[PDB]
Amino acid sequence: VMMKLFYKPGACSLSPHIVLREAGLDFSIERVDLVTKKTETGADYLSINPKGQVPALVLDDGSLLTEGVAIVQYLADKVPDRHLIAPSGTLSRYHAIEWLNFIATELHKGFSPLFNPNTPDEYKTIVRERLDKQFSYVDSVLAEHDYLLGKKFSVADAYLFTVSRWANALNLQIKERSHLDQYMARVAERPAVKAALAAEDI
């Protein structure tokens, strides 16, 4: 069967959405309401992904893959000719895995209290201060080469771009951001990024 990506516009699922397009693979997308857990076809999403989260990818064997970091690696490895991640077993691949884990744990999950309407303002300020430090660190790495892992665009950039959009939407203060901003401007120009954004109507 053709792959299907479950997504919410602008959510973390934008990362494998971009990767799908960078990879030139065939796929469809299906929007999910994360509150009601119903998809845009009326389907009960919990019967699909019990974790009730996006992204989830239906593979061509009909099975489901969850967790963004797993999905983008799966997709990149399907298209080695596109060099969207270093080949398995190489030190470069372990550093790609390192950065994917950093993005998932320190950036992505770092936003959790900010998106919870039960979190009080004062704690949100503390959370924002930590994200300042983390994004500023990323900025320092981006001073050294065009993309996160080096000179070449990779799946880690799809993920970084996605969470960085949240930083801008939340008007996050970032002390060191000049390299990050130039990086974001460039990544936003990629045809696959533009097409993913258009498909999500954002």
**What SS3 class is residue 115?**
helix
Q: Report yes or no: 4 and 61 within 8 Å, Cβ to Cβ.
A: no
Distance (Å, rounded) from C-alpha 38 to C-alpha 35? 8
| Nearest residue to 153 via CA among 110, 191, 181 | 191
Total chain residues near ligand GSH (CB under 6 A): 13
Binding to a copy of itself by residue 120, rule CB under 8 A? yes
- Between 5 and 96, CB nearer to Cl ion: 5
Q: Which of 30, 67, 176, 181 binds a copy of itself (CB under 8 A)?
A: 67
Q: Which of 3, 5, 11, 96 binds ligand GSH (CB under 6 A)?
A: 11
Binding to ligand GSH by residue 24, rule CB under 6 A? no
- Between 119 and 173, CB nearer to a copy of itself: 119
> Could you say which DSSP state residue 53 is in?
-
Distance (Å, rounded) from C-alpha 155 to C-alpha 71? 10
- Between 12 and 23, CB nearer to ligand GSH: 12
Instruction: Give me the phi and psi of 29, to 5 degrees please.
Output: -125, 150
Q: Which of 67, 77, 146, 181 binds ligand GSH (CB under 6 A)?
A: 67
5: enclosing H helix or E strand: strand 3-7
Query: Which does residue 11 touch among ligand GSH, Cl ion, a copy of itself, none (CB within 5 to 8 A, set by kind)?
Result: ligand GSH
Q: Report yes or no: 79 and 20 within 8 Å, Cβ to Cβ.
A: no
* 64-66 vs 27-33, strand pairing mode: unpaired
How would you classify residue 118: left for phi > 0, otherwise alpha for psi between -120 and 50, otherwise beta?
Answer: alpha
Contacts (CB under 5 A) with Cl ion, residues 14-53: 26
Binding to ligand GSH by residue 173, rule CB under 6 A? no
**What SS3 class is residue 73?**
helix
| Residue 171 labeled ligand binder | no
| Residue 12 labeled ligand binder | yes
Q: Where does this chain bind ligand GSH (CB under 6 A)? A: 11-12, 34, 52-54, 67-68, 101-102, 104-106
Q: Where does this chain bind a copy of itself (CB under 8 A)? A: 50-51, 59, 63, 65-70, 73-74, 77, 88-89, 91, 94-95, 97-98, 101-102, 104-105, 108-109, 113, 116, 118-120, 122-123, 126, 137
